Structure formats: structure tokens, C-alpha cells
PDB file of C-alpha atoms in Angstrom:
ATOM      1  CA  UNK A  12     -30.757   2.529  -2.307  1.00 49.61           C
ATOM      2  CA  UNK A  13     -29.892   5.492  -0.049  1.00 49.34           C
ATOM      3  CA  UNK A  14     -28.050   8.833  -0.616  1.00 49.22           C
ATOM      4  CA  UNK A  15     -25.696   9.583   2.311  1.00 52.39           C
ATOM      5  CA  UNK A  16     -26.268  12.982   3.965  1.00 50.82           C
ATOM      6  CA  UNK A  17     -22.973  14.784   3.329  1.00 48.44           C
ATOM      7  CA  UNK A  18     -24.471  18.050   4.525  1.00 47.22           C
ATOM      8  CA  UNK A  19     -23.097  20.948   6.587  1.00 50.90           C
ATOM      9  CA  UNK A  20     -20.131  21.881   4.367  1.00 52.02           C
ATOM     10  CA  UNK A  21     -19.301  25.031   2.328  1.00 54.92           C
ATOM     11  CA  UNK A  22     -17.618  23.256  -0.573  1.00 53.33           C
ATOM     12  CA  UNK A  23     -18.645  21.003  -3.465  1.00 52.29           C
ATOM     13  CA  UNK A  24     -18.255  17.381  -2.313  1.00 52.60           C
ATOM     14  CA  UNK A  25     -16.559  16.274  -5.563  1.00 49.57           C
ATOM     15  CA  UNK A  26     -16.021  12.699  -4.327  1.00 47.70           C
ATOM     16  CA  UNK A  27     -13.044  10.777  -5.814  1.00 51.10           C
ATOM     17  CA  UNK A  28     -12.693   7.961  -3.288  1.00 51.65           C
ATOM     18  CA  UNK A  29     -14.814   6.234  -0.616  1.00 50.57           C
ATOM     19  CA  UNK A  30     -13.996   4.077   2.384  1.00 51.32           C
ATOM     20  CA  UNK A  31     -15.848   2.618   5.360  1.00 52.45           C
ATOM     21  CA  UNK A  32     -14.289   1.581   8.700  1.00 50.48           C
ATOM     22  CA  UNK A  33     -15.272  -0.929  11.435  1.00 49.55           C
ATOM     23  CA  UNK A  34     -17.866   1.421  12.922  1.00 48.31           C
ATOM     24  CA  UNK A  35     -19.643   2.418   9.707  1.00 49.90           C
ATOM     25  CA  UNK A  36     -18.027   5.875   9.517  1.00 51.25           C
ATOM     26  CA  UNK A  37     -17.819   6.846   5.786  1.00 53.07           C
ATOM     27  CA  UNK A  38     -14.729   8.665   4.462  1.00 55.19           C
ATOM     28  CA  UNK A  39     -14.655  10.477   1.112  1.00 60.05           C
ATOM     29  CA  UNK A  40     -11.836  12.303  -0.705  1.00 60.56           C
ATOM     30  CA  UNK A  41     -13.088  15.646  -1.965  1.00 58.66           C
ATOM     31  CA  UNK A  42     -11.272  16.400  -5.186  1.00 54.95           C
ATOM     32  CA  UNK A  43     -10.360  20.032  -5.672  1.00 52.55           C
ATOM     33  CA  UNK A  44      -7.187  22.155  -5.964  1.00 49.69           C
ATOM     34  CA  UNK A  45      -7.912  22.467  -2.259  1.00 47.27           C
ATOM     35  CA  UNK A  46      -8.159  18.776  -1.305  1.00 47.95           C
ATOM     36  CA  UNK A  47     -10.091  17.363   1.638  1.00 48.39           C
ATOM     37  CA  UNK A  48     -10.970  14.067   3.308  1.00 49.26           C
ATOM     38  CA  UNK A  49     -14.515  14.327   4.699  1.00 47.58           C
ATOM     39  CA  UNK A  50     -15.933  11.937   7.317  1.00 47.72           C
ATOM     40  CA  UNK A  51     -19.633  11.142   7.920  1.00 50.27           C
ATOM     41  CA  UNK A  52     -19.937   9.659  11.445  1.00 49.68           C
ATOM     42  CA  UNK A  58     -19.845  15.637   8.982  1.00 48.79           C
ATOM     43  CA  UNK A  59     -16.223  16.631   9.773  1.00 47.36           C
ATOM     44  CA  UNK A  60     -13.289  17.617   7.568  1.00 46.22           C
ATOM     45  CA  UNK A  61     -10.265  15.584   8.712  1.00 46.31           C
ATOM     46  CA  UNK A  62      -7.079  17.648   9.537  1.00 47.85           C
ATOM     47  CA  UNK A  63      -4.948  16.732   6.526  1.00 44.36           C
ATOM     48  CA  UNK A  64      -2.741  19.536   5.156  1.00 43.85           C
ATOM     49  CA  UNK A  65      -1.653  20.179   1.575  1.00 43.21           C
ATOM     50  CA  UNK A  66      -3.790  17.662  -0.343  1.00 41.47           C
ATOM     51  CA  UNK A  67      -3.893  18.497  -4.032  1.00 39.51           C
ATOM     52  CA  UNK A  68      -6.557  16.567  -6.046  1.00 37.14           C
ATOM     53  CA  UNK A  69      -6.752  13.635  -3.636  1.00 36.06           C
ATOM     54  CA  UNK A  70      -7.626  10.307  -5.269  1.00 39.29           C
ATOM     55  CA  UNK A  71      -7.716   6.951  -3.461  1.00 43.80           C
ATOM     56  CA  UNK A  72      -8.241   6.390   0.231  1.00 44.95           C
ATOM     57  CA  UNK A  73      -8.449   3.456   2.586  1.00 45.03           C
ATOM     58  CA  UNK A  74      -8.946   2.968   6.307  1.00 44.01           C
ATOM     59  CA  UNK A  75      -7.571   0.060   8.353  1.00 41.87           C
ATOM     60  CA  UNK A  76      -8.879  -1.739  11.437  1.00 43.02           C
ATOM     61  CA  UNK A  77      -7.207   0.814  13.755  1.00 49.21           C
ATOM     62  CA  UNK A  78      -9.009   3.710  12.058  1.00 48.62           C
ATOM     63  CA  UNK A  79      -5.871   5.130  10.353  1.00 50.29           C
ATOM     64  CA  UNK A  80      -6.807   6.887   7.063  1.00 51.87           C
ATOM     65  CA  UNK A  81      -4.455   6.627   4.063  1.00 50.02           C
ATOM     66  CA  UNK A  82      -4.783   9.014   1.090  1.00 52.70           C
ATOM     67  CA  UNK A  83      -2.991   9.458  -2.235  1.00 53.27           C
ATOM     68  CA  UNK A  84      -2.895  12.716  -4.135  1.00 50.44           C
ATOM     69  CA  UNK A  85      -1.407  14.444  -7.199  1.00 51.25           C
ATOM     70  CA  UNK A  86       1.424  15.891  -5.185  1.00 54.82           C
ATOM     71  CA  UNK A  87       2.700  12.280  -5.655  1.00 53.34           C
ATOM     72  CA  UNK A  88       2.533  11.071  -2.111  1.00 51.88           C
ATOM     73  CA  UNK A  89       0.627   8.903   0.321  1.00 52.19           C
ATOM     74  CA  UNK A  90      -0.257  10.525   3.640  1.00 52.59           C
ATOM     75  CA  UNK A  91      -1.693   8.891   6.748  1.00 54.03           C
ATOM     76  CA  UNK A  92      -3.606  10.216   9.729  1.00 51.30           C
ATOM     77  CA  UNK A  93      -3.857   7.944  12.809  1.00 50.66           C
ATOM     78  CA  UNK A  94      -7.279   7.992  14.475  1.00 49.93           C
ATOM     79  CA  UNK A  95      -7.769  11.248  16.410  1.00 45.78           C
ATOM     80  CA  UNK A  96      -4.328  12.663  15.435  1.00 46.32           C
ATOM     81  CA  UNK A  97      -3.779  16.161  14.007  1.00 46.96           C
ATOM     82  CA  UNK A  98      -0.302  15.365  12.564  1.00 44.95           C
ATOM     83  CA  UNK A  99      -0.241  13.485   9.245  1.00 41.47           C
ATOM     84  CA  UNK A 100       2.801  11.459   8.229  1.00 43.43           C
ATOM     85  CA  UNK A 101       4.157  11.022   4.714  1.00 44.93           C
ATOM     86  CA  UNK A 102       4.929   7.441   3.831  1.00 44.91           C
ATOM     87  CA  UNK A 103       8.345   6.811   2.245  1.00 47.24           C
ATOM     88  CA  UNK A 104       7.158   5.786  -1.197  1.00 47.53           C
ATOM     89  CA  UNK A 105       9.531   6.833  -3.907  1.00 48.46           C
ATOM     90  CA  UNK A 106       8.991   8.086  -7.428  1.00 50.07           C
ATOM     91  CA  UNK A 107       5.197   8.076  -7.615  1.00 50.10           C
ATOM     92  CA  UNK A 108       3.657   9.741 -10.670  1.00 51.53           C
ATOM     93  CA  UNK A 109      -0.085  10.479 -10.428  1.00 51.76           C
ATOM     94  CA  UNK A 110      -0.962   7.750  -7.932  1.00 51.99           C
ATOM     95  CA  UNK A 111      -4.672   6.930  -7.980  1.00 53.37           C
ATOM     96  CA  UNK A 112      -6.038   3.895  -6.083  1.00 53.19           C
ATOM     97  CA  UNK A 113      -4.763   2.795  -2.690  1.00 49.98           C
ATOM     98  CA  UNK A 114      -5.367  -0.313  -0.562  1.00 51.25           C
ATOM     99  CA  UNK A 115      -4.207  -1.496   2.875  1.00 54.75           C
ATOM    100  CA  UNK A 116      -4.051  -5.208   3.761  1.00 55.41           C
ATOM    101  CA  UNK A 117      -4.650  -6.889   7.166  1.00 55.65           C
ATOM    102  CA  UNK A 118      -0.857  -6.842   7.862  1.00 57.17           C
ATOM    103  CA  UNK A 119      -0.758  -3.052   7.258  1.00 57.79           C
ATOM    104  CA  UNK A 120       1.072  -3.099   3.905  1.00 59.38           C
ATOM    105  CA  UNK A 121       0.022  -0.230   1.634  1.00 59.08           C
ATOM    106  CA  UNK A 122      -0.595  -0.725  -2.061  1.00 61.00           C
ATOM    107  CA  UNK A 123      -0.672   2.155  -4.548  1.00 62.26           C
ATOM    108  CA  UNK A 124      -1.726   2.078  -8.197  1.00 60.76           C
ATOM    109  CA  UNK A 125       1.031   4.333  -9.502  1.00 61.58           C
ATOM    110  CA  UNK A 126      -0.852   5.173 -12.653  1.00 60.86           C
ATOM    111  CA  UNK A 127       1.728   7.340 -14.356  1.00 64.31           C
ATOM    112  CA  UNK A 128       4.385   4.589 -14.012  1.00 64.98           C
ATOM    113  CA  UNK A 129       2.130   1.665 -15.028  1.00 65.27           C
ATOM    114  CA  UNK A 130       2.833  -0.191 -11.812  1.00 64.18           C
ATOM    115  CA  UNK A 131       1.561  -1.147  -8.402  1.00 64.39           C
ATOM    116  CA  UNK A 132       3.954  -0.445  -5.538  1.00 60.62           C
ATOM    117  CA  UNK A 133       3.810  -1.918  -2.057  1.00 63.10           C
ATOM    118  CA  UNK A 134       5.208  -0.711   1.274  1.00 65.00           C
ATOM    119  CA  UNK A 135       5.231  -3.177   4.186  1.00 60.89           C
ATOM    120  CA  UNK A 136       4.222  -1.583   7.528  1.00 63.41           C
ATOM    121  CA  UNK A 137       7.132   0.269   9.197  1.00 63.77           C
ATOM    122  CA  UNK A 138       9.299  -0.277   6.078  1.00 61.97           C
ATOM    123  CA  UNK A 139      11.052   2.448   4.097  1.00 57.57           C
ATOM    124  CA  UNK A 140      11.866   0.645   0.838  1.00 57.41           C
ATOM    125  CA  UNK A 141       9.071  -0.204  -1.576  1.00 52.53           C
ATOM    126  CA  UNK A 142       8.652  -3.243  -3.804  1.00 51.74           C
ATOM    127  CA  UNK A 143       7.149  -3.175  -7.291  1.00 50.62           C
ATOM    128  CA  UNK A 144       4.621  -6.000  -7.613  1.00 48.91           C
ATOM    129  CA  UNK A 145       5.131  -8.436 -10.504  1.00 53.33           C
ATOM    130  CA  UNK A 146       2.207  -7.337 -12.676  1.00 54.34           C
ATOM    131  CA  UNK A 147       2.799  -7.403 -16.421  1.00 54.13           C
ATOM    132  CA  UNK A 148       1.491  -5.229 -19.182  1.00 53.52           C
ATOM    133  CA  UNK A 149      -0.342  -2.656 -17.033  1.00 49.05           C
ATOM    134  CA  UNK A 150      -1.493   0.487 -18.799  1.00 46.98           C
ATOM    135  CA  UNK A 151      -2.693   3.402 -16.612  1.00 47.85           C
ATOM    136  CA  UNK A 152      -3.913   1.237 -13.727  1.00 49.03           C
ATOM    137  CA  UNK A 153      -6.346   3.078 -11.526  1.00 49.44           C
ATOM    138  CA  UNK A 154      -7.882   1.059  -8.689  1.00 51.33           C
ATOM    139  CA  UNK A 155      -6.272  -1.484  -6.371  1.00 50.27           C
ATOM    140  CA  UNK A 156      -7.670  -3.807  -3.691  1.00 51.11           C
ATOM    141  CA  UNK A 157      -6.294  -6.629  -1.557  1.00 50.13           C
ATOM    142  CA  UNK A 158      -8.308  -9.485  -0.011  1.00 52.21           C
ATOM    143  CA  UNK A 159      -7.721 -11.385   3.228  1.00 52.84           C
ATOM    144  CA  UNK A 160      -5.638 -14.113   1.496  1.00 53.01           C
ATOM    145  CA  UNK A 161      -3.313 -11.450   0.052  1.00 51.99           C
ATOM    146  CA  UNK A 162      -4.576 -11.610  -3.538  1.00 52.80           C
ATOM    147  CA  UNK A 163      -4.140  -8.200  -5.203  1.00 50.46           C
ATOM    148  CA  UNK A 164      -6.683  -6.923  -7.718  1.00 52.78           C
ATOM    149  CA  UNK A 165      -6.070  -4.018 -10.091  1.00 54.26           C
ATOM    150  CA  UNK A 166      -8.204  -2.254 -12.638  1.00 54.20           C
ATOM    151  CA  UNK A 167      -5.919  -2.104 -15.644  1.00 51.40           C
ATOM    152  CA  UNK A 168      -7.949   0.724 -17.089  1.00 52.29           C
ATOM    153  CA  UNK A 169      -6.496   1.267 -20.540  1.00 51.51           C
ATOM    154  CA  UNK A 170      -6.389  -2.501 -21.160  1.00 53.33           C
ATOM    155  CA  UNK A 171     -10.093  -2.876 -20.283  1.00 54.05           C
ATOM    156  CA  UNK A 172      -9.489  -5.619 -17.792  1.00 52.91           C
ATOM    157  CA  UNK A 173      -9.280  -6.494 -14.116  1.00 51.32           C
ATOM    158  CA  UNK A 174      -6.187  -8.496 -13.163  1.00 52.36           C
ATOM    159  CA  UNK A 175      -5.479 -10.477  -9.998  1.00 49.99           C
ATOM    160  CA  UNK A 176      -2.042 -11.359  -8.686  1.00 47.89           C
ATOM    161  CA  UNK A 177      -2.692 -14.703  -6.941  1.00 49.67           C
ATOM    162  CA  UNK A 178      -0.783 -15.009  -3.630  1.00 47.63           C
ATOM    163  CA  UNK A 179      -0.365 -18.815  -3.913  1.00 49.22           C
ATOM    164  CA  UNK A 180       1.061 -19.041  -7.456  1.00 50.39           C
ATOM    165  CA  UNK A 181       2.341 -15.445  -7.815  1.00 47.92           C
ATOM    166  CA  UNK A 182       0.812 -15.638 -11.329  1.00 48.34           C
ATOM    167  CA  UNK A 183      -1.232 -12.810 -12.871  1.00 48.24           C
ATOM    168  CA  UNK A 184      -4.681 -13.826 -14.194  1.00 49.33           C
ATOM    169  CA  UNK A 185      -7.435 -11.842 -15.926  1.00 48.96           C
ATOM    170  CA  UNK A 186     -10.805 -12.033 -14.133  1.00 47.34           C
ATOM    171  CA  UNK A 187     -13.866 -12.853 -16.320  1.00 49.13           C
ATOM    172  CA  UNK A 188     -15.788  -9.602 -16.061  1.00 47.50           C
ATOM    173  CA  UNK A 189     -18.355  -9.409 -18.891  1.00 46.72           C
ATOM    174  CA  UNK A 190     -17.672  -6.702 -21.479  1.00 45.42           C
ATOM    175  CA  UNK A 191     -15.889  -4.327 -19.112  1.00 48.70           C
ATOM    176  CA  UNK A 192     -14.617  -1.025 -20.523  1.00 49.07           C
ATOM    177  CA  UNK A 193     -12.153   1.314 -18.751  1.00 48.62           C
ATOM    178  CA  UNK A 194     -12.684  -0.073 -15.237  1.00 47.96           C
ATOM    179  CA  UNK A 195     -11.835   2.509 -12.588  1.00 45.34           C
ATOM    180  CA  UNK A 196     -12.853   1.781  -9.009  1.00 46.76           C
ATOM    181  CA  UNK A 197     -12.432  -1.548  -7.267  1.00 47.11           C
ATOM    182  CA  UNK A 198     -13.125  -3.181  -3.952  1.00 48.75           C
ATOM    183  CA  UNK A 199     -13.049  -6.729  -2.619  1.00 45.86           C
ATOM    184  CA  UNK A 200     -15.175  -8.139   0.240  1.00 46.97           C
ATOM    185  CA  UNK A 201     -14.559 -10.890   2.821  1.00 42.33           C
ATOM    186  CA  UNK A 202     -15.891 -13.636   0.436  1.00 40.87           C
ATOM    187  CA  UNK A 203     -13.585 -12.520  -2.380  1.00 42.47           C
ATOM    188  CA  UNK A 204     -16.357 -10.801  -4.352  1.00 42.73           C
ATOM    189  CA  UNK A 205     -14.848  -8.139  -6.555  1.00 43.82           C
ATOM    190  CA  UNK A 206     -16.827  -4.935  -7.242  1.00 42.37           C
ATOM    191  CA  UNK A 207     -15.842  -2.654 -10.096  1.00 42.49           C
ATOM    192  CA  UNK A 208     -17.022   0.699 -11.583  1.00 41.06           C
ATOM    193  CA  UNK A 209     -16.252   1.828 -15.133  1.00 43.17           C
ATOM    194  CA  UNK A 210     -15.847   5.145 -17.049  1.00 44.40           C
ATOM    195  CA  UNK A 211     -17.971   3.753 -19.953  1.00 39.80           C
ATOM    196  CA  UNK A 212     -21.342   2.803 -18.550  1.00 41.12           C
ATOM    197  CA  UNK A 213     -22.421   4.248 -15.145  1.00 42.33           C
ATOM    198  CA  UNK A 214     -22.750   0.703 -13.765  1.00 41.17           C
ATOM    199  CA  UNK A 215     -21.255  -0.948 -10.743  1.00 43.36           C
ATOM    200  CA  UNK A 216     -20.616  -4.636 -11.434  1.00 42.71           C
ATOM    201  CA  UNK A 217     -19.653  -7.607  -9.246  1.00 45.81           C
ATOM    202  CA  UNK A 218     -18.012 -11.009  -9.666  1.00 43.93           C
ATOM    203  CA  UNK A 219     -18.282 -13.707  -7.014  1.00 45.36           C
ATOM    204  CA  UNK A 220     -15.094 -15.658  -6.357  1.00 44.78           C
ATOM    205  CA  UNK A 221     -14.663 -18.402  -8.977  1.00 44.15           C
ATOM    206  CA  UNK A 222     -17.645 -17.230 -11.065  1.00 43.14           C
ATOM    207  CA  UNK A 223     -17.573 -17.009 -14.872  1.00 41.95           C
ATOM    208  CA  UNK A 224     -20.106 -14.160 -15.221  1.00 38.40           C
ATOM    209  CA  UNK A 225     -20.390 -10.736 -13.540  1.00 39.14           C
ATOM    210  CA  UNK A 226     -23.698  -9.005 -12.738  1.00 39.47           C
ATOM    211  CA  UNK A 227     -24.837  -5.406 -12.548  1.00 38.83           C
ATOM    212  CA  UNK A 228     -25.868  -4.072  -9.158  1.00 40.11           C
ATOM    213  CA  UNK A 229     -29.340  -2.420  -9.067  1.00 40.48           C
ATOM    214  CA  UNK A 230     -28.305   1.216  -8.456  1.00 42.18           C
ATOM    215  CA  UNK A 231     -30.519   3.778 -10.309  1.00 41.44           C
ATOM    216  CA  UNK A 232     -29.442   7.366 -10.447  1.00 41.31           C
ATOM    217  CA  UNK A 233     -25.762   6.973 -11.278  1.00 41.13           C
ATOM    218  CA  UNK A 234     -23.613   9.458 -13.166  1.00 40.76           C
ATOM    219  CA  UNK A 235     -19.847   8.819 -13.294  1.00 39.84           C
ATOM    220  CA  UNK A 236     -19.340   6.299 -10.423  1.00 40.00           C
ATOM    221  CA  UNK A 237     -15.536   6.596  -9.616  1.00 38.50           C
ATOM    222  CA  UNK A 238     -15.042   4.642  -6.430  1.00 38.49           C
ATOM    223  CA  UNK A 239     -16.570   1.821  -4.523  1.00 34.57           C
ATOM    224  CA  UNK A 240     -16.285   0.471  -1.014  1.00 36.39           C
ATOM    225  CA  UNK A 241     -17.875  -2.475   0.756  1.00 37.84           C
ATOM    226  CA  UNK A 242     -18.537  -2.744   4.529  1.00 35.09           C
ATOM    227  CA  UNK A 243     -18.664  -5.833   6.736  1.00 35.32           C
ATOM    228  CA  UNK A 244     -22.476  -6.133   6.192  1.00 36.28           C
ATOM    229  CA  UNK A 245     -21.571  -6.226   2.442  1.00 35.80           C
ATOM    230  CA  UNK A 246     -23.378  -2.974   1.828  1.00 33.91           C
ATOM    231  CA  UNK A 247     -21.886  -1.231  -1.201  1.00 36.92           C
ATOM    232  CA  UNK A 248     -21.041   2.412  -1.325  1.00 38.37           C
ATOM    233  CA  UNK A 249     -20.337   4.334  -4.532  1.00 37.19           C
ATOM    234  CA  UNK A 250     -18.867   7.790  -5.116  1.00 35.72           C
ATOM    235  CA  UNK A 251     -21.353   9.038  -7.711  1.00 35.93           C
ATOM    236  CA  UNK A 252     -19.189  11.942  -8.870  1.00 32.99           C
ATOM    237  CA  UNK A 253     -21.517  13.322 -11.558  1.00 32.33           C
ATOM    238  CA  UNK A 254     -24.261  13.965  -8.951  1.00 30.51           C
ATOM    239  CA  UNK A 255     -21.917  15.055  -6.137  1.00 32.71           C
ATOM    240  CA  UNK A 256     -22.994  12.359  -3.745  1.00 32.61           C
ATOM    241  CA  UNK A 257     -22.302   8.996  -2.218  1.00 33.70           C
ATOM    242  CA  UNK A 258     -25.001   6.315  -2.663  1.00 34.19           C
ATOM    243  CA  UNK A 259     -25.270   3.041  -0.755  1.00 31.99           C
ATOM    244  CA  UNK A 260     -27.027  -0.187  -1.608  1.00 27.11           C
ATOM    245  CA  UNK A 261     -27.803  -2.299   1.449  1.00 26.92           C
ATOM    246  CA  UNK A 262     -27.127  -6.014   1.199  1.00 24.16           C
ATOM    247  CA  UNK A 263     -29.730  -8.685   1.948  1.00 24.59           C
ATOM    248  CA  UNK A 264     -30.358  -9.253   5.674  1.00 24.27           C
ATOM    249  CA  UNK A 265     -28.497 -12.616   5.812  1.00 24.72           C
ATOM    250  CA  UNK A 266     -25.268 -10.663   5.401  1.00 25.17           C
ATOM    251  CA  UNK A 267     -25.703  -8.489   8.485  1.00 24.91           C
ATOM    252  CA  UNK A 268     -24.201 -11.067  10.902  1.00 25.99           C
ATOM    253  CA  UNK A 269     -20.371 -10.934  11.206  1.00 24.71           C
ATOM    254  CA  UNK A 270     -17.424 -11.247  13.627  1.00 25.51           C
TER     255      UNK A 270
END
């Protein structure tokens, strides 16, 4: 277990989201009235007008996607100084955000109890056929197009299967108010919760989740997983990002 050196900044880090790109750069949303996206290669990315930024994601091209409480999703192409606003419509306190391998953008529109999707280049959104959501917070999408959502106020993690289009509840053990979510290349789902200061995982097809051996955690809000399967957690209560390196047999990938 390692604390990332987010040093050389004036402001309180106040992490609300974490993401890792191809090259191991780590991106964090810094949640204040003045919002920022910070990158540890420490730089503050040139986003303008972020107000309490929440979820973020980064795709294979290095484009960074961020939701905030001005009810929008903004993107910044790699290197660019001009953000664009994606044409989502009618968001209400969007929290988690995910981007799939085809560039579609998924937003947990928490205030509207829904997950909305915008295909790449599109300008009309679709509401995904989830049922019975109640203040959903985190969203993730795996390589097969399965969508996972932390349905926070129903104390469950749901998965919209791409093959059946049916919603199923994943067997996480005694989960309460799940918040952050991420999915890795093997379909392992990682979740944080408001209730317990634990980060838990569930292997694909497994019947029991396990607790990851992090130690110092206070209020883990966000989780990300890199291609080595190292896990990163926004440990909000201690103003830091912690990572837990995977076993060596996971550090081969192409």
C-alpha cells in the first residue's frame, strides 16, 4: 500500500473521483466550490467553471470526462486547452461517469434516479433500462458492454447484462450504501461504501465478495483499476489517494 504524492499545490486535494490512463497518469477531481481536475504524471488541467466535480473517466486516447453539480459533462482532449460540453439533457446532480471502448459516455444521473448514455458523436441521449434505482452514484462499463451501477439508497450493485438486457443484482456480501465502482478487464467489480471504510471486490461469477487489505482508510469515495490491476482509492477523509499494487502475475498485459 502506497500514498500517491499529490504535492506542489496550494489547495486542499478533496478527492471525489479517480482515474488512471494507459500510461499510469492518475487523474483526480478536487471537490470544492472552485473545482479542479488534478493530474499526477502534478498539474491542474485547464478545465473552466467546474463546480463540485464528481465522477471522471479517461479513455484510450487520453480524453478526460468530468461531471459536476452545474449538471453537465465536460471533456478535454489530450493536450487541449478548450473543453467541450457534451449534449446531455436534463441532468440533476450527476455523480459517477464511465466511458466504454466505443466511446459512449455513461452518467449516473443521481437526482433523476437513472443512468443516461450518449453514443460518441451523438446528440440525443438514451435512458438505460434499469429499474427501481434510488440515488445511484457510481457507474462502470466492462469490455463486453455490461453496465454496473451502485444503487446507493437500495444497498445494492446492479448489472445490466448486454446479452439478455436483463438487470441482475450482484452478490456482494452485506453491502451498505455503495458509492464508488470500477470494473477490470476480467470483469472483477470493485466497490466502496459510505458505511464501512472498506473497498470490496467480486470476481466475475463469484458468490462471495472479499475485502481488499487497505489500512488507513477514511471515507473512500472512488476507485479505479489500471491494466496491472492495481487499485486506486480516493480516500477523502485523509485528503489522499492510496494504491494497492496487484500481485506480480498481473503485470503482463497487451
